[PDB]
């Protein structure tokens, strides 16, 4: 009930950068703050707003990707599986 997670340190830093506070979050809050992160760092393509260009951002480092489409988010799944504890 409420599956609280503790983001690993690099991911926590991304969430803080997006306005998050503390170090324990619901998965939903994590996704909220990751979206916000992308908005406020303008990592998305204003012309094709589903495409994220994360390469050379810490986020791209975490994902192991230069880019991803929110339309095909397997990379995000892989990354969150590895970087959210309990």
């Amino acid at each position: 009930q409420i599956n609280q997670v503790r983001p690993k340190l690099p991911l926590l830093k991304i969430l803080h950068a997006a306005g998050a506070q503390g170090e324990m979050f619901t998965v939903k809050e994590v996704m909220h703050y990751l979206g916000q992160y992308i908005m406020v760092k303008q990592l998305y393509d204003q012309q094709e707003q589903h495409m994220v260009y994360c390469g050379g951002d810490l986020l791209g480092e975490l994902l192991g990707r230069q880019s991803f489409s929110v339309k095909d988010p397997s990379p995000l799944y892989d990354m969150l599986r590895k970087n959210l504890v309990t």
């Binding site: 998965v27 939903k28 996704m31 929110v70 995000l76």
Partner: peptide, 9 residues
């Protein structure tokens, strides 16, 4: 579903 978790407006 993370897309669903996110979009529960």
């Amino acid at each position: 579903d993370l897309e669903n978790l996110y979009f529960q407006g």
